[PDB]
Amino acid sequence: MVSKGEELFTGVVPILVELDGDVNGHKFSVSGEGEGDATYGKLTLKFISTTGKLPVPWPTLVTTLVQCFARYPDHMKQHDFFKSAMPEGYVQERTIFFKDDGNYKTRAEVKFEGDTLVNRIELKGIDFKEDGNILGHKLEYNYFSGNVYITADKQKNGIKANFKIRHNIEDGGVQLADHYQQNTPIGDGPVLLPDNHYLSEQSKLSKDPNEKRDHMVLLEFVTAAGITLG
């Protein structure tokens, strides 16, 4: 295989996610657990609030809550920055602008802690409207897709991207979320810096009928594409 980190993803890998959030001064914490299988680009995760009802909609947190699980085609293996940075990991920083509303700023570390891939996130949101689609809980809870154009950031020995997410509004309309992203390796070892390409993501949100805590069951598929086979 073309990176050492890639070798860590040949089978099913347990995942832990920890998020500490503050949106308009409303503090919340989310814990997630499950597993990923980069052979298929497939994640199965369950997330719970440990702080009571969340002050923002679950769908708005999906992109924040492990692109190292992407399925890269054989002819694209040299473009997988995310696995190359493992096991020491990478920092993932975003600003997410909700059109006509506030923004989230996120900083995460994605790394192996023992046998488990861990995503540990800090999220700060500001300038949200109390009657808006986010603080007002006006967004549909079901399914959405996204397509992320990954480009190298040579100066930072990492990658960057900007992309738009469209969240349906319950009973009609669309809330746009404009994402800006930068990732850099935590370790000193060589990484793969990619040619431009896409990660395609599909998110299916559901509920555990026996979970009384505010929660999200997530089935995620993540696939790389965008480079032609010779």
**Angle formed at CA 182 by CA 144 and CA 16, multiple of 5 degrees:** 60
Q: How far apart are CA 177 and CA 100, in angstroms?
A: 10
Decide if 162 contacts 168 (C-beta within 8 A): no
What is the pairing mode between strands 143-153 and 158-168?
antiparallel
Q: Specify if 109 maps to a domain.
A: yes
Q: Specify if 3 maps to a domain.
A: no
Terminal CA-CA length for the chain = 20
DSSP 212: -
User: Number of C-alpha atoms within 13 angstroms, CB side, residue 13?
Assistant: 32
Domain that holds residue 79: 14-225
Q: Specify if 4 maps to a domain.
A: no
Q: Specify if 159 maps to a domain.
A: yes
Q: Specify if 8 maps to a domain.
A: no
Q: How far apart are CA 110 and CA 215, in angstroms?
A: 22
Q: How far apart are CA 23 and CA 16, in angstroms?
A: 22
**Angle formed at CA 175 by CA 41 and CA 214, multiple of 5 degrees:** 65
Number of domains in the chain: 1
Nearest CA-CA partner of 92 in 102, 103, 81, 76: 81
Q: Specify if 123 maps to a domain.
A: yes
Residues in the chain: 230
Under 8 Å CB-to-CB from 147, ≥6 apart: which residues? 163, 198, 199, 200, 201
CATH number, domain with residue 180: 2.40.155.10
> Which resolution, in Å, applies to this structure?
1.6
Q: Specify if 6 maps to a domain.
A: no
